[PDB]
Design a protein around this ligand. Structure first.
Ligand SMILES: *[C@H](c1cccc(NC(=O)c2ccc(OC)cc2)c1)[C@H]1C(=O)Nc2ccc(F)cc21
Ligand SMILES: *[C@H](c1cccc(NC(=O)c2ccc(OC)cc2)c1)[C@H]1C(=O)Nc2ccc(F)cc21
Lengths: 72, 113, 72, 113
């Protein structure tokens, strides 16, 4: 499935993922695409910071959902 | 040229009853020189553009309608209002339906370059 | 009522308006706030360019709706 | 300091039953030093922050729930999912309820500076 990742700078990322992908997996895909190391990434969806061990489906992240990426 | 295109017809829920438009059509996305993204539908026989919507990120979702027995009914849904445009796929093959749906969403919600 | 006006490259504008305000009125409010002349403004909502003689309510623009502003 | 604040309690739809939380509460919006916007609820008696949501533009709408006869029930609605947080106003006066609602939306969807 496809999701979008918005940043502060405002450039949005299109990612292809799976429902069973962990948040850690998604950060790894972001590193692959954008070169941002996972340990600098905060992913947020529906008001909450997403935990590495949990899946996209755990947070009910679906086809064409948008996540927010904040750099720390 | 078109950034994305695929054969599809239009259709109306008149309420309870389901009225498909029989005409051969093409859904396409076009980026004009002002950089705006246009979601369009044209009649393939006449060439006339009937729908032309200027779409920005977060305006729209393009998704399959699960309730349709066909499996090839899709809706352009405006997230804010209750504006809904329904389409039925006319591509001879079905293997790219899900890909076409993803591409619509990509170019509407995050057009590259 | 409150509406938001997004621009292509720039900031979002918060406007206070009325349902009966014409699109021409809204462009005038944008001129008042931002100094952009009405004849350079294209307002878009739900895929369509808005006509000067019509009202916000004609287009079912409601509390906290977002319009898109494109500069000619 | 708080960018927006007002007295309000929390409440749950348990399906078909309304369950109001009777505790004295404060809804507020706070912008942290990283510039992120936080929608919060705290217990005014204890001072404990129970809700703290990081909100961006186009995530949320804050609006009155018209079905509630009270007239002072508001919902923080996430446009994407089905996440809903309900609140009942506890401000002694009612004349700023609509203004408080506008201010929430302003700072969530278009925070100044
Ligand atoms: C879905 C729905 C239910 C029953 C029948 C149809 N019709 C078609 O899918 C169809 C028939 C024939 C042709 O070729 C001429 C094309 C398509 C559809 C309902 C639904 O649940 N939601 C919905 C929304 C909009 C619609 F137009 C129809 C449906
Ligand atoms: C609205 C609703 C319908 C019936 C009754 C109430 N209750 C309250 O307004 C209320 C009662 C008592 C107090 O303080 C003790 C505070 C508030 C509400 C429904 C609705 O239509 N949607 C909804 C959503 C969430 C809710 F909690 C209630 C409602």
């Amino acid at each position: 499935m496809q999701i979008f990742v918005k940043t502060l700078t405002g450039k949005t990322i299109t990612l292809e993922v799976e429902p069973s992908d962990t948040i850690e997996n998604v950060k790894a895909k972001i590193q692959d695409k954008e070169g941002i190391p996972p340990d600098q990434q905060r992913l947020i969806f529906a008001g909450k910071q997403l935990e590495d061990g949990r899946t996209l489906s755990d947070y009910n992240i679906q086809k064409e959902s948008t996540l927010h990426l904040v750099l720390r | 040229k078109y950034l994305v295109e695929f054969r599809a017809g239009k259709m109306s829920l008149k309420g309870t009853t389901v009225t498909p438009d029989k005409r051969k059509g093409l859904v396409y996305i076009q980026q004009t020189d002002d950089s705006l993204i246009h979601f369009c539908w044209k009649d393939r026989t006449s060439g006339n553009v009937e729908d032309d919507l200027i779409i920005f990120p977060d305006d729209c979702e393009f998704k399959r309608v699960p309730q349709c027995p066909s499996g090839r009914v899709y809706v352009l849904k405006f997230k804010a209002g209750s504006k809904r445009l329904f389409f039925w796929m006319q591509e001879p093959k079905t293997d790219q339906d899900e890909e076409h749906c993803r591409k619509v969403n990509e170019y509407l919600n995050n057009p590259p370059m």
